Short mmCIF file of C-alpha atoms and ligand atoms in Angstrom, two decimals:
data_model
loop_
_atom_site.label_atom_id
_atom_site.label_comp_id
_atom_site.label_asym_id
_atom_site.label_seq_id
_atom_site.Cartn_x
_atom_site.Cartn_y
_atom_site.Cartn_z
CA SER A 1 -77.26 64.30 -120.92
CA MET A 2 -76.28 63.16 -117.49
CA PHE A 3 -72.81 64.22 -117.45
CA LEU A 4 -71.43 66.18 -120.39
CA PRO A 5 -67.75 66.42 -120.16
CA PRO A 6 -65.96 69.77 -120.40
CA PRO A 7 -63.43 70.34 -123.23
CA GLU A 8 -59.92 69.13 -122.72
CA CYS A 9 -57.29 71.52 -121.56
CA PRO A 10 -54.08 72.12 -123.66
CA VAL A 11 -51.28 69.31 -123.31
CA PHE A 12 -47.89 70.48 -124.03
CA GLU A 13 -45.13 68.06 -125.01
CA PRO A 14 -41.68 70.23 -124.78
CA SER A 15 -38.72 68.92 -126.63
CA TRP A 16 -35.79 68.57 -124.22
CA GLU A 17 -34.48 72.01 -125.16
CA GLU A 18 -37.54 73.47 -123.85
CA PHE A 19 -37.87 71.22 -120.92
CA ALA A 20 -34.39 72.41 -119.53
CA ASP A 21 -35.72 75.46 -118.01
CA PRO A 22 -39.21 74.97 -116.42
CA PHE A 23 -39.70 78.80 -115.67
CA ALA A 24 -39.05 79.83 -119.32
CA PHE A 25 -41.12 76.93 -120.54
CA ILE A 26 -43.90 78.12 -117.97
CA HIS A 27 -43.38 81.75 -119.26
CA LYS A 28 -43.74 80.57 -122.93
CA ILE A 29 -47.13 78.56 -122.29
CA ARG A 30 -48.76 81.24 -120.06
CA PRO A 31 -50.73 82.90 -123.02
CA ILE A 32 -52.36 79.80 -123.75
CA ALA A 33 -52.75 77.95 -120.51
CA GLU A 34 -53.71 81.15 -118.66
CA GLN A 35 -57.05 81.04 -120.85
CA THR A 36 -57.84 77.54 -119.32
CA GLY A 37 -56.46 77.57 -115.93
CA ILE A 38 -54.87 74.17 -116.02
CA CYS A 39 -52.62 72.56 -118.58
CA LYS A 40 -50.85 69.38 -118.72
CA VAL A 41 -47.22 68.85 -119.49
CA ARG A 42 -45.91 65.59 -120.75
CA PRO A 43 -42.09 65.52 -120.11
CA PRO A 44 -39.89 64.30 -123.08
CA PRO A 45 -40.15 60.33 -123.06
CA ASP A 46 -36.81 59.65 -121.55
CA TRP A 47 -37.07 62.01 -118.51
CA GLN A 48 -37.93 59.23 -115.95
CA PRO A 49 -37.08 60.10 -112.60
CA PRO A 50 -36.91 56.84 -110.51
CA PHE A 51 -39.45 56.37 -107.68
CA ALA A 52 -38.47 54.06 -105.06
CA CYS A 53 -39.61 53.50 -101.50
CA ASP A 54 -40.68 50.68 -99.14
CA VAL A 55 -44.62 50.04 -99.21
CA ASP A 56 -44.55 48.81 -95.34
CA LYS A 57 -42.40 51.42 -93.95
CA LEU A 58 -44.17 54.52 -95.39
CA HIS A 59 -47.17 55.16 -92.83
CA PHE A 60 -49.69 57.81 -92.69
CA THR A 61 -53.11 58.70 -91.46
CA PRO A 62 -55.84 59.02 -93.81
CA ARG A 63 -58.57 61.65 -94.02
CA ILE A 64 -62.07 60.36 -94.45
CA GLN A 65 -64.37 61.74 -97.03
CA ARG A 66 -67.87 61.96 -97.79
CA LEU A 67 -68.91 62.24 -101.11
CA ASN A 68 -71.67 64.84 -101.36
CA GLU A 69 -72.14 67.82 -103.92
CA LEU A 70 -72.38 71.32 -102.43
CA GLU A 71 -71.57 69.74 -98.70
CA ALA A 72 -68.83 71.73 -96.97
CA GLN A 73 -65.55 70.25 -96.43
CA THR A 74 -62.55 71.96 -94.78
CA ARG A 75 -59.59 72.39 -96.84
CA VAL A 76 -56.58 71.40 -94.95
CA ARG A 77 -56.43 55.44 -87.52
CA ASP A 78 -53.24 54.57 -89.65
CA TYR A 79 -52.58 52.79 -93.07
CA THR A 80 -49.07 51.75 -94.50
CA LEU A 81 -48.81 52.40 -98.66
CA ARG A 82 -49.47 48.46 -98.81
CA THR A 83 -52.50 48.37 -96.60
CA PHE A 84 -53.86 51.56 -98.20
CA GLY A 85 -53.42 50.16 -101.73
CA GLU A 86 -54.95 46.84 -100.79
CA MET A 87 -58.20 48.79 -99.40
CA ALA A 88 -58.19 51.00 -102.41
CA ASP A 89 -57.99 48.06 -104.82
CA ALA A 90 -60.72 46.02 -103.13
CA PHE A 91 -62.78 49.22 -102.91
CA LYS A 92 -62.84 49.99 -106.50
CA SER A 93 -62.85 46.25 -107.60
CA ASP A 94 -66.01 45.50 -105.38
CA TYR A 95 -67.91 49.03 -106.49
CA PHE A 96 -67.82 48.11 -110.27
CA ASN A 97 -67.34 44.11 -109.89
CA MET A 98 -64.57 44.31 -112.29
CA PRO A 99 -60.56 44.32 -112.32
CA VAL A 100 -59.23 47.66 -111.84
CA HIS A 101 -57.63 48.53 -115.33
CA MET A 102 -60.79 47.46 -117.02
CA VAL A 103 -63.05 50.11 -115.70
CA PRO A 104 -62.95 52.93 -118.28
CA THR A 105 -62.09 56.69 -117.24
CA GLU A 106 -65.26 57.84 -118.73
CA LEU A 107 -67.29 55.66 -116.61
CA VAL A 108 -65.62 56.41 -113.43
CA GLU A 109 -66.03 60.22 -114.14
CA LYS A 110 -69.82 59.47 -114.89
CA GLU A 111 -70.10 57.54 -111.90
CA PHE A 112 -68.53 59.92 -109.75
CA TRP A 113 -70.88 62.92 -110.58
CA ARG A 114 -74.00 60.66 -110.32
CA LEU A 115 -72.77 59.25 -106.91
CA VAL A 116 -72.28 62.73 -105.38
CA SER A 117 -75.70 63.96 -106.49
CA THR A 118 -77.58 61.29 -105.03
CA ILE A 119 -78.48 61.33 -101.37
CA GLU A 120 -79.26 57.98 -100.96
CA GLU A 121 -75.88 57.24 -102.08
CA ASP A 122 -73.56 57.71 -98.96
CA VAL A 123 -70.17 56.41 -100.37
CA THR A 124 -67.35 57.36 -98.08
CA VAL A 125 -63.49 57.09 -99.29
CA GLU A 126 -60.17 57.97 -97.66
CA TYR A 127 -57.04 59.48 -98.92
CA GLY A 128 -53.64 60.85 -97.83
CA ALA A 129 -52.62 64.39 -98.07
CA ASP A 130 -49.53 65.60 -96.24
CA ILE A 131 -46.33 67.56 -96.22
CA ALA A 132 -43.19 65.30 -96.36
CA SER A 133 -41.47 64.46 -93.19
CA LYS A 134 -39.22 61.48 -92.31
CA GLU A 135 -42.45 59.30 -92.19
CA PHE A 136 -43.76 60.71 -95.63
CA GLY A 137 -40.89 61.58 -97.84
CA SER A 138 -40.68 63.12 -101.25
CA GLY A 139 -41.45 60.96 -104.46
CA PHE A 140 -38.56 62.68 -106.24
CA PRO A 141 -34.81 61.91 -104.89
CA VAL A 142 -33.17 63.95 -102.46
CA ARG A 143 -29.67 64.12 -100.73
CA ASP A 144 -29.61 62.02 -97.48
CA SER A 145 -24.31 58.06 -111.61
CA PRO A 146 -24.96 60.73 -114.18
CA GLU A 147 -28.67 59.83 -114.58
CA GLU A 148 -29.63 59.35 -110.89
CA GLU A 149 -27.79 62.42 -109.98
CA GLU A 150 -29.40 64.41 -112.77
CA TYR A 151 -32.78 63.81 -111.13
CA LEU A 152 -31.60 65.54 -107.99
CA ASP A 153 -30.95 68.91 -109.40
CA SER A 154 -33.63 69.00 -112.09
CA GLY A 155 -36.18 72.12 -112.06
CA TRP A 156 -38.83 69.64 -112.42
CA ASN A 157 -37.92 67.86 -109.33
CA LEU A 158 -40.38 69.58 -107.24
CA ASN A 159 -38.24 69.90 -104.06
CA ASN A 160 -36.14 72.46 -106.14
CA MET A 161 -38.92 74.46 -107.82
CA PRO A 162 -39.78 76.43 -104.59
CA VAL A 163 -36.14 76.93 -103.68
CA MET A 164 -34.77 77.82 -106.87
CA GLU A 165 -33.45 81.53 -107.54
CA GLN A 166 -36.72 81.96 -109.87
CA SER A 167 -39.46 81.27 -107.04
CA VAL A 168 -39.54 84.53 -105.17
CA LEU A 169 -40.91 82.18 -102.41
CA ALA A 170 -37.06 80.90 -102.14
CA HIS A 171 -36.14 84.29 -100.54
CA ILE A 172 -38.94 84.02 -97.89
CA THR A 173 -37.17 83.48 -94.70
CA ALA A 174 -40.55 83.43 -92.76
CA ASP A 175 -42.04 80.03 -91.88
CA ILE A 176 -44.42 79.10 -94.88
CA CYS A 177 -44.16 75.49 -94.84
CA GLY A 178 -47.36 74.93 -96.51
CA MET A 179 -46.32 76.85 -99.53
CA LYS A 180 -42.73 75.90 -100.20
CA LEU A 181 -42.53 72.11 -99.04
CA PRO A 182 -44.29 69.55 -101.29
CA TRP A 183 -47.37 67.77 -100.51
CA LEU A 184 -47.89 64.15 -101.06
CA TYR A 185 -51.49 63.03 -102.07
CA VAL A 186 -52.17 59.20 -101.86
CA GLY A 187 -55.36 58.63 -103.62
CA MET A 188 -57.96 56.01 -104.28
CA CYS A 189 -61.23 55.55 -106.54
CA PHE A 190 -63.33 58.66 -106.17
CA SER A 191 -60.98 60.42 -103.48
CA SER A 192 -61.64 64.03 -104.54
CA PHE A 193 -60.22 67.44 -104.17
CA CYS A 194 -62.78 70.48 -103.78
CA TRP A 195 -62.93 73.44 -105.83
CA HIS A 196 -59.90 75.92 -104.83
CA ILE A 197 -57.46 78.39 -105.69
CA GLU A 198 -54.00 78.37 -104.11
CA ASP A 199 -53.02 80.45 -101.12
CA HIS A 200 -51.72 84.07 -102.42
CA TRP A 201 -53.06 83.06 -105.81
CA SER A 202 -49.85 81.09 -106.46
CA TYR A 203 -49.25 78.62 -109.15
CA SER A 204 -49.29 75.06 -108.29
CA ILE A 205 -47.45 72.20 -110.09
CA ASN A 206 -48.32 68.31 -109.57
CA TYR A 207 -46.67 65.34 -110.67
CA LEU A 208 -48.41 62.00 -110.55
CA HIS A 209 -45.47 59.68 -109.71
CA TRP A 210 -47.46 56.28 -110.32
CA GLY A 211 -50.98 54.55 -110.38
CA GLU A 212 -54.14 55.16 -111.89
CA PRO A 213 -54.96 58.76 -113.29
CA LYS A 214 -56.04 61.87 -111.59
CA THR A 215 -58.97 63.63 -113.11
CA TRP A 216 -58.86 67.44 -113.19
CA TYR A 217 -61.43 70.30 -113.72
CA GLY A 218 -60.03 73.85 -114.36
CA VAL A 219 -61.30 77.37 -114.71
CA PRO A 220 -59.16 80.36 -115.95
CA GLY A 221 -58.36 83.19 -113.64
CA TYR A 222 -60.24 85.61 -115.46
CA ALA A 223 -63.54 83.74 -114.40
CA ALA A 224 -62.47 83.37 -110.84
CA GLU A 225 -65.39 85.59 -109.59
CA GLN A 226 -68.08 84.37 -112.01
CA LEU A 227 -67.50 80.96 -110.66
CA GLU A 228 -67.71 82.46 -107.06
CA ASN A 229 -70.95 83.90 -107.76
CA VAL A 230 -72.32 80.74 -109.02
CA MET A 231 -71.13 79.04 -105.84
CA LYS A 232 -72.32 81.76 -103.68
CA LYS A 233 -75.90 81.45 -104.82
CA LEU A 234 -75.83 77.79 -104.66
CA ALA A 235 -73.92 77.20 -101.30
CA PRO A 236 -73.68 80.47 -99.20
CA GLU A 237 -72.70 78.62 -95.98
CA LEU A 238 -69.34 78.12 -97.73
CA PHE A 239 -68.74 82.10 -97.86
CA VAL A 240 -69.47 82.71 -94.05
CA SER A 241 -65.76 84.27 -93.03
CA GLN A 242 -63.29 81.74 -91.57
CA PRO A 243 -62.23 82.44 -87.92
CA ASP A 244 -58.59 81.33 -89.00
CA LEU A 245 -56.52 79.85 -91.78
CA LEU A 246 -57.26 76.39 -90.66
CA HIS A 247 -61.10 76.50 -91.33
CA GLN A 248 -61.23 77.05 -95.20
CA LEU A 249 -64.87 75.69 -96.55
CA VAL A 250 -64.60 74.13 -99.86
CA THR A 251 -67.07 71.92 -101.95
CA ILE A 252 -67.72 69.39 -104.54
CA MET A 253 -69.60 70.95 -107.47
CA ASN A 254 -70.47 69.61 -110.90
CA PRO A 255 -68.43 71.41 -113.69
CA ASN A 256 -71.71 71.25 -115.72
CA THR A 257 -73.62 73.44 -113.30
CA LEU A 258 -70.81 75.89 -114.05
CA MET A 259 -70.88 75.46 -117.66
CA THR A 260 -74.65 76.13 -117.44
CA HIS A 261 -73.80 79.70 -115.83
CA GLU A 262 -71.22 80.15 -118.65
CA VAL A 263 -68.19 79.91 -116.45
CA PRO A 264 -65.61 78.38 -118.84
CA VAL A 265 -64.41 74.95 -117.51
CA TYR A 266 -61.70 72.46 -118.93
CA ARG A 267 -60.81 68.88 -118.05
CA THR A 268 -58.10 66.53 -118.13
CA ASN A 269 -56.84 62.81 -117.12
CA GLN A 270 -53.54 63.17 -115.78
CA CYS A 271 -51.48 59.85 -116.38
CA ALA A 272 -48.53 58.81 -114.25
CA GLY A 273 -45.28 60.67 -115.31
CA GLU A 274 -47.42 63.56 -116.43
CA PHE A 275 -47.53 67.16 -114.63
CA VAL A 276 -50.52 69.60 -114.27
CA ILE A 277 -49.85 73.15 -113.91
CA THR A 278 -52.60 75.52 -112.29
CA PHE A 279 -52.49 79.00 -113.13
CA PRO A 280 -52.77 81.95 -110.51
CA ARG A 281 -56.68 82.17 -109.40
CA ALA A 282 -57.27 79.35 -111.59
CA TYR A 283 -60.15 77.52 -109.68
CA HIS A 284 -59.53 73.56 -109.65
CA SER A 285 -60.95 70.30 -108.58
CA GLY A 286 -61.04 66.82 -109.40
CA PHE A 287 -60.92 63.09 -108.22
CA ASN A 288 -58.71 60.00 -108.43
CA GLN A 289 -59.65 57.24 -110.75
CA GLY A 290 -57.83 54.70 -108.51
CA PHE A 291 -55.09 53.93 -106.34
CA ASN A 292 -52.26 56.55 -107.02
CA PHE A 293 -49.39 58.91 -105.67
CA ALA A 294 -48.96 62.32 -106.46
CA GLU A 295 -46.79 65.30 -105.44
CA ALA A 296 -47.39 68.89 -105.60
CA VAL A 297 -45.82 72.14 -104.59
CA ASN A 298 -46.90 75.99 -104.90
CA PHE A 299 -44.67 78.45 -106.58
CA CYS A 300 -44.61 81.97 -107.89
CA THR A 301 -42.81 83.61 -110.78
CA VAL A 302 -42.15 87.07 -111.66
CA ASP A 303 -45.44 87.18 -113.74
CA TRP A 304 -47.22 86.54 -110.56
CA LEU A 305 -45.84 89.59 -108.55
CA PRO A 306 -48.70 92.01 -109.44
CA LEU A 307 -51.24 89.37 -108.74
CA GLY A 308 -49.56 88.46 -105.40
CA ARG A 309 -50.41 92.15 -104.48
CA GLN A 310 -53.79 92.32 -105.78
CA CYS A 311 -54.57 88.82 -103.80
CA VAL A 312 -53.51 90.48 -100.71
CA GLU A 313 -55.67 93.59 -101.29
CA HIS A 314 -58.70 91.04 -101.95
CA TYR A 315 -58.07 89.30 -98.86
CA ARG A 316 -58.21 92.47 -96.98
CA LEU A 317 -61.72 93.03 -98.21
CA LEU A 318 -62.75 89.72 -97.38
CA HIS A 319 -61.06 89.78 -93.97
CA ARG A 320 -59.13 86.49 -95.03
CA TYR A 321 -55.95 85.72 -93.02
CA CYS A 322 -52.45 85.82 -95.01
CA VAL A 323 -50.09 83.10 -95.29
CA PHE A 324 -47.05 85.54 -95.32
CA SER A 325 -46.61 89.36 -95.73
CA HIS A 326 -46.10 90.23 -99.41
CA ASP A 327 -44.66 93.65 -98.64
CA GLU A 328 -42.13 91.88 -96.36
CA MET A 329 -41.07 89.45 -99.26
CA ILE A 330 -40.47 92.70 -101.55
CA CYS A 331 -38.49 94.31 -98.91
CA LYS A 332 -36.56 91.28 -98.07
CA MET A 333 -35.64 90.68 -101.96
CA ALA A 334 -34.81 94.50 -102.21
CA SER A 335 -32.39 94.02 -99.29
CA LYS A 336 -30.72 91.39 -101.50
CA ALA A 337 -30.79 93.22 -104.69
CA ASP A 338 -26.81 92.54 -105.49
CA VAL A 339 -27.64 88.80 -105.61
CA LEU A 340 -30.83 88.53 -107.41
CA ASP A 341 -31.57 87.74 -111.10
CA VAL A 342 -31.60 90.85 -113.07
CA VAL A 343 -35.09 90.13 -114.38
CA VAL A 344 -36.25 89.26 -110.85
CA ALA A 345 -34.80 92.52 -109.74
CA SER A 346 -36.41 94.45 -112.55
CA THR A 347 -39.99 93.07 -111.79
CA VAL A 348 -39.61 93.50 -107.79
CA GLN A 349 -38.43 97.08 -108.43
CA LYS A 350 -42.01 97.81 -110.31
CA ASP A 351 -43.92 96.09 -107.39
CA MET A 352 -41.97 98.05 -104.93
CA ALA A 353 -42.68 101.36 -106.71
CA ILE A 354 -46.41 100.81 -106.38
CA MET A 355 -46.00 99.55 -102.67
CA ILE A 356 -44.06 102.72 -101.89
CA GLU A 357 -46.54 105.07 -103.56
CA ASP A 358 -49.57 103.33 -101.89
CA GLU A 359 -47.71 103.80 -98.64
CA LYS A 360 -47.12 107.41 -99.12
CA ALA A 361 -50.70 107.93 -99.51
CA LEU A 362 -51.93 105.79 -96.61
CA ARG A 363 -49.52 107.65 -94.28
CA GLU A 364 -50.72 111.19 -95.45
CA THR A 365 -54.29 109.97 -94.86
CA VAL A 366 -53.69 108.79 -91.21
CA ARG A 367 -51.70 111.97 -90.59
CA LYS A 368 -54.62 113.92 -91.48
CA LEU A 369 -56.49 112.05 -89.13
CA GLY A 370 -54.56 113.28 -86.22
CA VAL A 371 -52.38 110.42 -85.63
CA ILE A 372 -48.85 112.40 -84.80
CA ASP A 373 -46.57 110.19 -82.93
CA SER A 374 -44.70 107.49 -84.56
CA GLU A 375 -42.05 104.90 -83.72
CA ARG A 376 -40.03 102.13 -86.03
CA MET A 377 -40.82 98.89 -85.28
CA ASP A 378 -39.34 95.66 -86.80
CA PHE A 379 -42.70 93.99 -87.77
CA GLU A 380 -41.05 90.76 -89.17
CA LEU A 381 -39.80 89.98 -85.68
CA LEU A 382 -43.39 89.52 -84.37
CA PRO A 383 -45.01 86.15 -84.76
CA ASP A 384 -47.89 86.40 -87.40
CA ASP A 385 -50.69 86.20 -84.66
CA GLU A 386 -49.20 89.27 -82.92
CA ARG A 387 -49.25 91.81 -86.19
CA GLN A 388 -52.60 91.06 -87.90
CA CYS A 389 -55.15 93.86 -88.48
CA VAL A 390 -58.10 93.52 -85.81
CA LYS A 391 -60.41 94.48 -88.66
CA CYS A 392 -59.40 92.94 -91.74
CA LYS A 393 -56.70 90.40 -90.57
CA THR A 394 -54.00 91.38 -93.02
CA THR A 395 -50.25 90.56 -91.82
CA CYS A 396 -48.69 93.92 -91.00
CA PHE A 397 -45.37 95.02 -92.19
CA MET A 398 -45.04 98.43 -93.78
CA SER A 399 -47.20 100.00 -90.99
CA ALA A 400 -49.99 99.84 -88.25
CA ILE A 401 -51.51 101.80 -85.59
CA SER A 402 -51.47 101.09 -81.92
CA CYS A 403 -52.83 102.69 -78.82
CA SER A 404 -51.52 102.05 -75.30
CA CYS A 405 -55.13 101.34 -74.02
CA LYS A 406 -55.36 97.87 -76.06
CA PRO A 407 -51.78 96.74 -75.56
CA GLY A 408 -50.40 94.30 -78.26
CA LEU A 409 -53.54 95.08 -80.97
CA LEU A 410 -52.87 96.55 -84.34
CA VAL A 411 -54.87 97.69 -87.26
CA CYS A 412 -53.65 98.29 -90.70
CA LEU A 413 -53.75 101.95 -92.13
CA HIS A 414 -56.98 101.14 -93.81
CA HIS A 415 -58.76 100.51 -90.31
CA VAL A 416 -57.49 103.60 -88.09
CA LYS A 417 -60.93 104.20 -87.14
CA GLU A 418 -61.26 100.47 -85.42
CA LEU A 419 -58.70 100.17 -83.06
CA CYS A 420 -60.51 101.74 -79.90
CA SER A 421 -62.53 104.90 -79.03
CA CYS A 422 -59.46 107.12 -77.97
CA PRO A 423 -58.86 110.31 -80.03
CA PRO A 424 -56.09 109.65 -82.75
CA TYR A 425 -53.64 111.79 -81.06
CA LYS A 426 -53.39 108.81 -78.62
CA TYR A 427 -52.39 106.45 -81.30
CA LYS A 428 -48.69 105.74 -82.68
CA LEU A 429 -47.83 105.18 -86.35
CA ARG A 430 -45.59 102.00 -86.01
CA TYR A 431 -43.55 101.60 -89.58
CA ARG A 432 -40.78 99.53 -90.72
CA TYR A 433 -39.21 101.84 -92.98
CA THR A 434 -39.24 105.84 -93.48
CA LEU A 435 -39.84 106.98 -96.86
CA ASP A 436 -36.35 108.03 -97.23
CA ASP A 437 -35.16 104.56 -96.15
CA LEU A 438 -37.44 102.97 -99.12
CA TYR A 439 -36.33 104.63 -102.17
CA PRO A 440 -32.72 103.69 -102.05
CA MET A 441 -33.81 100.10 -101.54
CA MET A 442 -35.67 100.52 -104.72
CA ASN A 443 -32.67 102.32 -106.47
CA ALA A 444 -30.36 98.99 -105.73
CA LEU A 445 -32.96 96.94 -107.63
CA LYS A 446 -32.78 99.47 -110.55
CA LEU A 447 -28.83 99.38 -110.36
CA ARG A 448 -29.08 95.47 -110.41
CA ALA A 449 -31.52 95.39 -113.27
CA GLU A 450 -29.38 98.12 -115.42
O1 OGA B 501 -53.87 66.02 -106.10
C1 OGA B 501 -54.73 66.61 -105.31
O2 OGA B 501 -55.33 65.77 -104.70
C2 OGA B 501 -54.74 68.19 -105.00
N1 OGA B 501 -53.78 68.97 -105.67
C3 OGA B 501 -53.88 70.25 -105.82
O3 OGA B 501 -55.01 70.96 -105.40
C4 OGA B 501 -52.71 71.06 -106.56
O4 OGA B 501 -51.80 70.13 -106.97
O5 OGA B 501 -52.86 72.41 -106.65
MN1 MN B 502 -73.92 61.19 -102.17
MN1 MN B 503 -54.52 73.05 -105.74
ZN1 ZN B 504 -56.97 96.30 -91.71
ZN1 ZN B 505 -57.03 103.65 -77.17
#
């Protein structure tokens, strides 16, 4: 009546054979898990990476969080892990007037949703979210016995997933620190993460190292726009376009609201030693049951490539900033075709064929607008902020239009009419590759793939 919990998401318990390769496993579960957005993976019972750290030497600056449904929050003092933990336990213990392990998870969940709905209640909490630095540090072992060395090179060690052969993000040489370095999340009771999807609609994978559970809600990829439509109606303030990457607006929203509007929603409690995986464009949110320590990272498989391209197109329509150029990633991999995995090479080839055919058509269109002059340009050398379309903010790589009347400004080939009021004959087509350069790059991939 008050809170009706969503149905449980899938839980997987892979054998050690299945667990050996994450990407094969993730590919295996995808048909199930993509229908629910999120899933939970329990490793085999003896897969137990050692957590070790000094609670007095780990220092961080907490974010403060007000707990109000539909209120705007932006997506991205000082505590030690010890002093945070003391604050966190005391908070929950006083809130419920009980010892922490006695507080049932169903009650914290019920109470979270009551609390965020009531305006008279104005509970604020704190949490930690930051990338590993020399102060933060991964919860997994890194280089700085057979078992303790095993965890160093495990695929499920989240330092390795991004820079493994099979994250297409591995091959990016651009700075994308938010997207291949793990994030560390130090939770307390009710600290929450707002509804979101990952940058470039990537996967995320999250491991709870220790402490009390993290409660998750997830929506499958196919329902993303339904969720957004429900959200736009209840909170249009969140949909006013953002002036930069560091101003993304997100919110807490009761999954029963979504379920009322027939958006499918699933839940889980992730406990210590369990993984949650979010699939491309799968909206998720949640909150911590209490004091805990999690670590998460983005990644991209071969299954993701075409969604990556759709995502960049969707960003263009919304005028949203990109973290990296997708076309630049594809060409970088083409230029390394000899050393790519052959299934990777095969999938890159297929995305590259679409890129080339779209680029060919776009160039024909701008030639017919009267843009005649052209010059090669190494777009990858420009900082990002010097190669965004004035109009749609897309990060340019394949091509752009410039005019000497506005030095340094560019539009992509969709926005040729948006640069300035000079006639198009004054413009230059700036291009990274001729069509004749591109066909042999794609062919190198074909050869690698057999
Ligand atoms: O754990 C959190 O607090 C937030 N994590 C995520 O959004 C994720 O892992 O994709
Ligand atoms: Mn409130
Ligand atoms: Mn996330
Ligand atoms: Zn544009
Ligand atoms: Zn001009």
